[PDB]
Amino acid sequence: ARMAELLREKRVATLVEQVRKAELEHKLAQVQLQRAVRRQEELHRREE
């Protein structure tokens, strides 16, 4: 039971956290970079 838990559960869960967090860092690099410069240029040109 301890072999199953510490040698499966925490590392398979760890795979799930780091995979969705690499995905979240992908989505967050998107929403910072392309979104932020696009919308500040749009708001800049719309107020001009």
Add this chain to the structure above:
RNA sequence: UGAACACUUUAAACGUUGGGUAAUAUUCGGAGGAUCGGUCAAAUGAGAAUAUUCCGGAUGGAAAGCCGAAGGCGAAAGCACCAACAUCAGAGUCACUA
């Protein structure tokens, strides 16, 4: 997926308020003196007091005649005078939400 924002685009979507109309029968005076109505066809009547009509006037509300279409909007029934109030809705782009 579902929903709110910023743009692009949509009309017979929805209720209220003001105004209009080809057209409608009734009526006030005038033209005109026996036809009109109507149907496969025939039959009460309008009419010898003036009928269809025609002139021009009033009335008052129906319905929106063409547009307009195997076109649109709608959840469906449905929705076809504008103008404005007005509350939406639906589609596309670009972003939020996880």
